[model samples]
Target: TLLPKPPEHHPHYAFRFIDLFAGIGGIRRGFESIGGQCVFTSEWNKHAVRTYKANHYCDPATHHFNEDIRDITLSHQEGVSDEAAAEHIRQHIPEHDVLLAGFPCQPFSLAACDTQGTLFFDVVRIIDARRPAMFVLENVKNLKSHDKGKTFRIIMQTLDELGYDVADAEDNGPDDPKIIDGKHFLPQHRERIVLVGFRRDLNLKADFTLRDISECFPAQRVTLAQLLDPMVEAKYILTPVLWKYLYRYAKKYGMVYPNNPQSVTRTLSARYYKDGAEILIDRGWDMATGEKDFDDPLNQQHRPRRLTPRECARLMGFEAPGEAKFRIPVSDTQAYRQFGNSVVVPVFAAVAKLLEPKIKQAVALRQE
Candidate 1:
């Protein structure tokens, strides 16, 4: 996150925050640059948590790490009321000035509305219990229109009922701050809706719009060349069988693109671990040449290569071109999943930079 790390309560300590759905600590890394100390973390995926722990710190004495937010906040005990569950959350989760969460967007798989409620419910419970001075919620861009818009409506209604001022959807346009594209900071056209809210009673919500983050973006967009390694091992290139299949079905698949080194890429999905066809590199291999010989293992020139896990890390803003490479302590399959699901570092960092002053103000006011 922050280089030349600050000790606890260092002058740079702008606020305390938590990471829910904390994929590989991307959002945490972003906030860390602006002086946020993470007091709690909730992520169920062990592979993501593995990468997250390797990249971020955890305090054994103070930080509370949970496998799932629901177990502690919503369904901690059978027949327990919401108030008791919230109280339990308050008792264990440290007081923080901010709450940061990027809840899941896969609704078909999230269909089990049984006793668990929506994952968002768990997040609401935490916020209601702790009353964090500020919160930054991130989710897939589709969340705004999920369930024919009713899903987002309910989310906003819940936030309003919780007594916070939120970023609304009117921020939708070519340059909507609520729906930010990662390409502004990196070469990936990743869009996520960012919701930043301030406790209405705290009087800290004035003059801040999510759009302020635009000012924090890089003056120039990053190129794929800058994010890529000069030469990757041949292992990352697609095998002939898979390449032939993708080539034959090219008309049917939408994610496949004849990509250039200088342009932005399509969104990276969690399923990227299975195939990199969506982001195939444009090596000037004649399509006609590949038609004759589909059986060669030496088709690096004709067969597009998958962005290596390291490249995926750079694409996700977890690593930099000339800096220390981000740690990858897992297998390539798991590493791909972690990076695919993670937030763009520089994008969130820009948001964090934009929110720093407000976070400080909210934290200071809360101290009273």
Candidate 2:
């Protein structure tokens, strides 16, 4: 069973936005907390769509849930040119105040940058056509250094050419100005690059800089123990063979166990279902002290276990400490990937808070 769903329409909306490359609606949840109504959503993964639809209820009359982004972009037909496809897409997409996309980061072929062959280029098409008041895009922190910086350079240059002023994090140093670490808002260490932009005609860029968004950070940090359940299923425990192999490998490689329950965890990746070796919890008994030691050597008595899917959802801030249980209606493996691929909800909630006024301001200016 799922939690009570948010209403299809907000009684009072600050602005409207669309979710693109929507991975189970993580970004959607963040923005919706601040009264942003989702006018449209596009996600390709079937299982993710299932999980997303299970949690969010949108009216088909006013909201569109699309399986393929290209369906909107290539509404004309199969082999139409990019120019024709974009025009058709522009007509189909409803006017929105803000655009949100946690787009995937794949290596872009230099030749495909100008064409619709790449996913990023498809995003470019929508921005060029709709020209929303503002836009927010999220991707891996390594995006700044991808393809030896050429990829990032092209992206910035393209957004600039399209007549939007991109926010810069110059205070963080010349390298990777837009990168934000999730530790400030959650008990996990996740680093992602966030891109915020406003249409240049709005002149909102002068008032916006990622460094100035102080509300996006938490007042106090939390530890992994806060998110962990007191008791998880026995199936999460690592078997003797896998535990021994991971122990030997960690010893040989001098890898520190993220075993301290009081400490934050390392980055959770989509591959967590493979072995859970990267972020293993400590459940072993100390040999000499006979006390609980998470980093104790592997033993048959009390072995460390992988985080349960519910724990993963908590780590991502999808569920609060003691209230508001988030729904996960998928298989364990699928749940792992969904939570792993999602953004920490509170981090982007802070971001949405910071952008709320700016978005409202832009909307007001448009009305005038």
Candidate 3:
């Protein structure tokens, strides 16, 4: 029998939070796993919204689902001045204990280039207006080095200006910092930078540390073989032409194939739907020659295959290999993209676990 669904309405929620850029509810799952109730969610992708709805049941009465984040922003409506919009959004948004946003990472300079405006700005606007007890922001690891660190500096400054004490991994030591690799929780090597902040007035900053959170990582790590499907469809197997091309390219670039089933795979990206070059699963060898030879000509005997959508879900820690609770209602291509673009669930679940006590303390302090 399938596991019972999580209670949609917690009689006594530990805390409340809002999910922004909520892609298929990956981050939301992490937060919800620890007793946080989601008060609002904003995701623009219709396909992602469909997938998210399939997995999670959000009540319309207390929870707000928005297609465009700007609709929640101050000047979302036409003929409204910037100040008016800001005040309007502030009044409209429900008060929450925490904010959760896994906003997309792009060049900060894109703000001037793109007409839709930078997503980070929206996060800043919300934080500035709502002043939640705490917030957890996520982005690609490259965000720190983007534009020679100027972008990250600006982000820190913006958060500081908003009266929040942002936690810097560097404060603990050089060894412990914000960039966390998902391999600690899953087989895939996905590294993302997380920015966790507490309102300065709350005084919860001293009690929180990213280094302390690292202690929650499971000592027993999962292997790629554990996430692989015992039998995948023939469609996942690479064709002769494509296999030949990839093999040749690997040889030319001295790229060592992740042919070992026991080893972890490389980072899975949103482009995984296009080609599964970064991660290829080993199929058993056709010819068991006693001697191994890398210099030998392309051997179709050991061509690797792409991971199936189910395997992708496992690699992202969406659910255990055959857990019936987690549903993949989208097509293979969309499923791949959704899983690839998502955060590893257990990795952030650890973060949520660490933040649980701290979140409660902050909420209590606010209430007092």
Candidate 4:
């Protein structure tokens, strides 16, 4: 049902959200930047929690309150239990309107390969308990094809059973419309499935496709070169020997030619710590050894160099954490892992800005 507009003079209201699987609080940052308050967050990885806290500076309870959703669902608020301090934890955290979850992709990841045991069900269990007005869920694109499409069907069916008006563009049919491909604007070709749902009772319908706004929305483009932290110098440059190996690998493996201006780079991966296969650099071969064949390659595989975590963070659309000179003295591998698992900030921010007005309108209608 369409909601009535608020009185023209009133200021729009802010809403609240809770972030589940909050990897470095990327979703939290995106939502907060647009006036949404995150009252709670939950992430199991201690290192990610550490980075999240380091960058955002909220208390540990805010991110890892450790209160299991099962306890909240099964027990009464007043019933005191000596077995655990569920009630004690509840006193500190507050309930919020929306749930933000950028959950694990292993079960659904093509890289992970159809692992039956997954944490996806855990999220539904929490939703069944919390019963928030809305929830936003995200996972890798392979989720659409996992378990030969049964996995996708079951998720939609489950959400429907839970009284959500679930809508999935990709799952609707092959004919479904396309959104703006990430590679079209960003240097990375990262594609993901974002599921946004509201309670059936809310009777709200929104179509969030970049394709719809492709014409009107101004181009928001940024290159890998632009996302680089200004002051941090590259850790290692390609040597001639390494560059030749990379070229051979590219030709043998049918890989995209290194430093090709025509191709946008491959999607950044968490395993970047192990190798630099995707973004090979071109280093001219040594002249002392005499010129190598023109067909000879100038790139290397699994290069020893790794992108600094601060650089990874900037690429993922967050402010880099370090000295004024972008000195990220922290562990680069850990940073790469965190950023790889995180939600893309600007992507979420754009959608949040678009939806904030509608959410505010919904809130105002209730007050009246």
Candidate 5:
């Protein structure tokens, strides 16, 4: 229960912000670390809500929690006057300096990704109606590549029409700083797109790009072994039957490779909550090297283990180094799903730190 409280009254209070589609508060924590007050949050999943409530200190008296972003948006799906909807939105969601939104999981899925760009509309609805000075939105990198770039164009065009200046717009030159990888800080390689913008009318500045994120990385990148617990419960290891199935499934596809300690792991999928194949811990499999030995006790005990939820927490950059661990206030299945769907905390935290100056300037300008 050593979770840090949001600094509502700290001398360095950076800004008031709203967390939209805030899954377990990963983006919220990143911004909170830099002194932002979360005046509003909207997340639908019940299990994620349990974890968010336990770990984040949100006061019912001041901070608001919403379940449906649709109901809180400017208007109904059919129709509503812009003036009326804007007034309704302002009544439901508090005014803030910055808005943080993550619209990904549906887009993170294979086929679902192609079909669910509609959710992005809701995010735009809030930004267009409220007009915060600054906004940060994160999503699966595929958001740009999906539907063969048509999806990307519509998003950029809509936001541009909303009159916000994006930091990495126009030129794709030099691969850009729009897509940030998590491996620079953790052993996992989760590359998510973090599109940032500042309102044009305010004349605020946000020259910061994701490349500056590395400047704020941990002194040394953490090894996969370091994040893992030396000893884990036997229950986490795969069953012999399940191991045979997975090993055969991979071998059948000729997709067998032992990820060494020196190697960074693959991108974690939300499917990890199912059987943990997305990121299985290798215990030195011999099935692929030699004759398949389904009866070997050594191989049986050494079967790859699904990372415990606690380990997943660390792997996902949820913990503060040399400090208290990020609390998991849910079951193992729930934990895996949350972290799998969550953002890389270190990268986003560093991104927030990079934007600290701009956020302060915008907030101050609004006040005056």
Candidate 6:
């Protein structure tokens, strides 16, 4: 018996994505969450590479770190030019439909203070060479004001030259332009710029706004307290001497901590492993006789110390198994650094979902 034909309006398809600058596979997680497959990734960070391999199963040859794309072109094994490599890479690069990049933003970031941003051009060169159906990019928010907007202008022009429809984020956009505080669910408020572009030839129309996308990419926001490994079986009990140190530290900072044992933790940072400064312990002060009592239960303002590297992974959504499992050997410091540099998985998933239909259309059109 013949099966009934599916409705024309039904959306059906899974697209492929290549992750560039894949820090601990954050962008890879995003695409995978949306039912998209990751074909390749390029990240030179040694720690990030370990983490990526630990979490996912894919070809290492597809991932290039330190090896420039131009150098790949120079090799005559396939073809030396963009035209030849594009077709050849289609085989090794896994016939991906989209390109995802969270290119280095440090050069243009406020902390670095250099007016020029070169990474954007490198991404442009890749786009021109590959001409993927769609591309997504992320960068620091400082890009808007860097060089009095000259950096942004160049990005816009470059994308324009590559034949893409671009959108600049303004303050009044439908989506809440603020960083989705990890603390809202966990313990951080990292914010960055995310730019999405589709090839003009694809003719895919996105009717939704960023706010709508956020809802689509819903994540189970886990609190820092909840992520504590139950297997560890130890309540963070501090010694008397360590308790005194915490008290002094809290006093110097001029911050108050709740007496409740179930209070949520503060944001975590790259420096968290050094010492729990932003989020500290609180030992209540003694009310009797107004004398300073270090030993008194009430006169203490000390909480459990800092979070471990494994805890940081739970906060950044890297706890799930994939290519990242291979990165287990990376040190705690580098592990935290990789997660801090990663993308919010659910957000990327939502964007990939929104793009799936268009990718299908392009694929079908190409076949026709």
**Residue by residue across 157-260, what tens digits does model 4's lDDT show?**
77777787654434455433222245643566677766777777766546644344244333656555555444444564444565457556666611333244
Clashing pairs in 3: 74-85, 74-86
Q: Rate the local accuracy (lDDT) of all candidates.
A: 0.77, 0.77, 0.75, 0.57, 0.77, 0.57
Pairs that collide in candidate 5 are none
| lDDT by residue (tens digit), candidate 5, 1-368 | 36546555654467889999898988888888888888899999988988888788787766899888878763345567666766778888888889999975343132312323366767777787789998998877766777676667667777888898887776555475788888888888788878898899887754656666768877778777767776778988888878778766876612213345566777777878788887777777676443555767775666778888887888777774333457787889889889999998888788889888888888888788
lDDT of 2 by residue, 1-368 (tens): 45445555556677889999988888888888878888889999999988888777676777888888877776325677667876788777888999998878866574424433567877888988798988999988887778887677777878889898888733335554588788888777898989988888877766666765556666676667777777678999888778767766665611223445447677888988788776777775344442354344454667768888888888887787644466788999999899888998887887888788888887788788
Q: Residue 230: error of model 4 in Å?
A: 6.0
Quote the lDDT for 233 in model 6.
21
Model 6 agreement with the true structure over 112-147: per-residue lDDT tens digits = 113223555546656766778888887765666667
- What is the C-alpha local distance difference test score of candidate 4? 0.57
> Residue 248 error for model 4, in Å?
4.0
TM-score of each: 0.89, 0.89, 0.87, 0.73, 0.89, 0.71
Note the clash tally of each candidate.
0, 0, 2, 6, 0, 29
How much does each candidate deviate from the true structure in C-alpha RMSD?
3.7, 3.6, 4.0, 8.4, 3.9, 7.9
State the displacement of the C-alpha of residue 322, model 5, in Å, after optimal TM-score superposition: 7.7
Give lDDT tens digits, candidate 3, residues 1-368: 33235575555678889999999888888888888888888899989988888777577777878888777783335576656756866665688888999987656664311313577877887776788999999987877777787677677777777888877734523343787888777766788888999888878878577767669787787666666666678888777778667666765611223445447677788888887877777665333331354333555555668887888888888878565356777999999899888989887888898888889897788788
Candidate 2 regions with alpha-carbon error over 4 angstroms: 1-4, 7-9, 75-83, 112-116, 169-175, 253-262, 287-298
Residue 47 displacement (Å), model 3:
0.7
RMSD in angstroms between candidate 1 and the native structure over all alpha carbons = 3.7
Higher-TM-score candidate among 3 and 5? 5
